[PDB]
Design a protein around this ligand. Structure first.
Ligand SMILES: Nc1ncnc2c1ncn2[C@@H]1O[C@H](COP(=O)(O)OP(=O)(O)O)[C@@H](O)[C@H]1O
Ligand SMILES: Nc1ncnc2c1ncn2[C@@H]1O[C@H](COP(=O)(O)OP(=O)(O)O)[C@@H](O)[C@H]1O
Ligand SMILES: Nc1ncnc2c1ncn2[C@@H]1O[C@H](COP(=O)(O)OP(=O)(O)O)[C@@H](O)[C@H]1O
Lengths: 421, 421, 421
């Protein structure tokens, strides 16, 4: 790996965006001219951490975001700018409250046991009007819009541009779909080592929002952006691999899954409640859990349970939504899963039923149904909090304030239903 | 007591409003011509209970609301109509889920022990525009509007009319004030036997709303109707009396209070959390508990604690808000208090401090901070649920549905704070 | 077979639209980058079938749409994209509820008797404003607009573009007409093997809609889109052929038709009622049957009957409308016809009269006059239902639901005519 300064000269990069993800998933970046990249690659870009979602004080020394040169992406729509993901450092060490640092820590524990997490994300999003008031396509109106050829091709320019970028970047994109809400789309690409996928997922949201804007549109990954439409998931596909390239999840047990997979699964099931706080991290998230289908079960090739087993050597957690932190969520999933493996956790019986029809009759534990309860579940889950380190309590702090902020709002519903009390 | 038919002939009453209060405090009434009052006074007015907030089925027999002839009030603004409060009966017996029946049951238990609850209510309300969008007086704007002579006299017509009605009805009204929010008023009258006060409180809200409408205005008892203004309380004054006319609360202990009073108080303190669900019964209610001042303490002549001791032989519960059921709330207070007396409950130390300044430093139990948590507190409080009978679980059911209804609403705050997640 | 990956390289195709038609005729497609076509061509593109009109559950495994490489069409207006028609497979076999699969089944039965159905379609459509409120040409206004030269040429650019595409695609287009309603047009091309014509029919609607949109206009195949104008037919021309290449309908009987042709006709007459549900598949469809001409008769070179004999070796079914599924329609027609042939059905006497003038005096069976009755007829016709397989029952299920949805709408007619009852 050559230096970024030399790459800048060779590939015509004039500015670098040195970037990191805070606790709320917000992309924080600094635009640095190429003349300054050498110093910053080694010493890091200085940011006042208290000004981001990092649970820091104005009295603290500036954090130093150290770029991972392997993450470099020349913006495909603006190649004279080089994007870099970074680890936030504080007082000479990675700062445990930064999502990407948290993720790297859990990975290092799994890696030490020769277990390498790989995942793929299904990042649904909506294409909407710039003012956010409606979807971008007024002609996308029918009751079952999923895979609608007409509406898909009406947004060919934006979708095709983005997919072609992903081809060039080497993500191995393989399908673009219109999803089951009007105005909603999904663009899939190959799974990879968790850190690779996490970096891609963070960049992907930024690319989609950016390219949409250039087309006079807007993209949102909001969990439930419209009252009358279903929402955005981020269903996650999970497998564990040895450094020698074998999928520990492949086995001769049920459905081609191994004991390791089922123990991992058992951690997922066992830690589902606190896990919800992290993978459904906003007040808005909880609308998708109250629509009925809010219990903890799996699985099989069945898109009706919290966990689906799509094929051999693979689990799909169907819990995370569009707001899920690209680093915190694989981190939290891995912590729960690793615990499952170590404790030989038992997932219980696979249910081969349609939960939307027969779910009412199944005795199952229930997920937390609002942000506050979910945070409480996270705080009571010591194994999970310990797996995320200091990030967990900082996350719980912020979400509790969001909760109180939300509840303090005077809504129309309140006035409509209470004015005559 | 003569018959209502004979009174109708003598006082020129052409219609009776036979009325009862459901679990949400909603006044349900039927307008019956005088020719039919005799049968209904004895047999009751038939209502389909499932259509009110009574937790009933369409398959149930109609309830029979039996008028309390002693409650009769010729509408002062329309004397040809006679208003009556009623006990809802079902299958030949008072229906334990009806608020007024619940209240009468608790009273009968206290009465059996020669303890007679008397209370006064401070029913603050706002005078607002008919469309509810702003207060009725655009010139009522200053930062400290409390007792504002100008704004008070600007609403003299409406206030004076209502107070004069209360004089004629024999309620012993003694003061009308502009309260500490712009547009907010209060009109006090003498305390009385709980059932008398409860009937008056129910009628009072109706009279104020009715008279406001006749003046082209509107009244609301909503807890927190405006984002920028403080809200409506219903602080309640409480004492217990023997049939021989002695105030059991008067004594030689601290502040002129007796051991009975302090044990009653101890029930209040001891049952405060579940009590909150009943006396802060709406989602909206909880805004007033998050503004800081949400802990459980008393007292002294100090408007800064959950309980104030204004004078000898008197407790003021400063907890209830404008949405409090006129029957359920004295009922719930009495259940908690009676328990305190029977268990010789200990309130702990009176705090002679200003909670708004030093509250942060006091170790005290905290009230529930949202409707859901408050309902949970009610459900966990067996003594309190048992004291209200079947009304308690029916109340909890409805409020839980209100909670889920509220949370399902897509708010602007959500879109503003999450669209860019 | 030069593979799709190879064809993509040489033809410069960057994306494929893998498409299938659902039970409501809706085009469902996935946009796949060339780099992924090889795998999808072999294994199929995955779709959640419950999200389309296929009568499935979210608990079902995804269907796999397997593309027919012989259907490949480079979109003539956007040749970097390659459209493919696909067969829906479920759990390792063709999904009988998918129209194209159902059609292929019926064709295989017939093929097994050396009878190969060939058909051509007259897919009338309107050109309208994007908002759908009026036709595209405000100057197209005369009482008898059929074949209007001015209006035809006023839309030359769009019509000519589409026709030239059909020339290049090898469909053998031969005429473009302005039809007998203002704003209505028709573009004819050579008949072919049923499956070829079906795929083309499906693609054609998409082409016309897409090209219209590129010209700032819009196309609709809605059966009756305007209250004041006549509607869109999809009249179908039908013949049966041996593999040797002879037209089984050509014979010595009347009008140059054979006994086989007449028995086929007899199946059409015999199953006309049930057939109506499939080829008039919407509530809106039934307007064209209540506008008189709704009895079951043929024929001769006479456009006044349900079936017309245009010439030797050919039958024209004048029943299907613009909403007819391009796959279900020929399938249902073939099912009926084959039965006619197997049972030696007697079509009755040819009526050489004008049904518009003398039709009232003829004794003939009447077609069903609304969607509900038509569905009932489909369900009662077990020979027809059995011939379409599971597609029939799923179709009827959806249509019964559409019917209930329609009836549940509060129409202005209802209010105008009932408000004063
Ligand atoms: N063994 C695996 N481990 C982790 N992720 C995987 C694995 N296999 C596939 N994926 C990823 O899961 C995501 C979804 O894949 P997909 O084949 O579309 O699943 P499905 O057919 O169930 O919808 C993709 O990003 C994909 O690359
Ligand atoms: N001994 C009592 N028991 C119950 N309520 C009382 C008692 N004495 C007064 N009240 C009532 O309490 C309410 C408030 O009285 P008020 O004298 O204005 O109290 P404060 O001075 O503390 O504001 C009135 O309705 C009043 O009649
Ligand atoms: N023998 C046949 N079998 C099936 N379809 C046919 C046959 N001959 C013609 N067609 C198709 O029927 C459609 C109508 O043909 P056309 O010549 O316009 O007849 P008409 O003048 O009666 O409308 C055309 O699309 C044509 O391809």
């Amino acid at each position: 790996m050559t230096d970024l300064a030399s790459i800048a000269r060779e590939k015509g990069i004039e500015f670098f965006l040195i970037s990191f993800t805070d606790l709320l998933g917000v992309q924080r970046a600094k635009l640095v001219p190429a003349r300054a990249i050498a110093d910053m690659a080694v010493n890091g870009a200085g940011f006042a951490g208290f000004a981001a979602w990092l649970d820091m004080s104005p009295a603290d020394a500036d954090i130093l975001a150290i770029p991972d040169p392997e993450s470099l992406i020349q913006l495909p729509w603006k190649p004279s700018v080089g994007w870099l993901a970074a680890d936030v450092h504080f007082e000479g060490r990675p700062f445990p409250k930064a999502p990407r640092v948290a993720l790297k820590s859990v990975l290092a524990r799994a890696a030490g046991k020769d277990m390498h997490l790989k995942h793929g994300v299904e990042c649904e999003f909506f294409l909407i009007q710039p003012d956010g008031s409606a979807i971008s396509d007024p002609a996308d109106t029918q009751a079952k819009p999923c895979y609608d050829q007409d509406a898909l091709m009406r947004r060919f320019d934006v979708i095709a541009e983005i997919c072609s970028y992903m081809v060039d970047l080497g993500w191995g994109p393989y399908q673009n779909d219109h999803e089951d809400a009007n105005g909603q789309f999904e663009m899939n690409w190959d799974y990879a080592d968790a850190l690779v996928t996490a970096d891609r997922h963070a960049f992907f949201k930024f690319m989609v929002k950016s390219v949409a804007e250039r087309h006079g549109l807007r993209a949102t990954f909001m969990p439930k952006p419209f009252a009358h439409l279903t929402g955005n998931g981020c269903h996650t596909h999970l497998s564990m691999w040895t450094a020698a390239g074998d999928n520990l999840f492949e086995g001769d047990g049920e459905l081609g899954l191994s004991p390791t997979a089922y123990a991992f699964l058992g951690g997922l099931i066992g830690h589902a409640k606190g896990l919800t706080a992290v993978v459904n991290p906003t007040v808005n998230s909880y609308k998708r859990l109250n629509a009925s289908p809010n219990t903890i079960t799996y699985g099989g090739n069945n898109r009706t349970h919290m966990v689906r087993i799509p094929d051999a050597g693979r689990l799909e957690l169907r819990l995370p939504d569009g707001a899920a932190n690209p680093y915190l969520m694989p981190a939290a999933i891995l912590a729960a899963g690793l615990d499952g493996i170590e404790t030989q956790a038992d997932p219980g019986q696979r249910l081969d039923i349609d939960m939307y029809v027969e779910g009412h009759s199944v005795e199952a534990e229930q997920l937390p149904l609002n942000l506050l309860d979910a945070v409480r579940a996270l705080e009571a889950d010591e194994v999970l909090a310990g797996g995320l380190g200091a990030a967990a309590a900082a996350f719980a702090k912020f979400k509790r304030a969001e909760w109180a902020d939300y509840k303090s709002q005077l809504t129309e519903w309140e006035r409509r239903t209470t004015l005559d009390c």
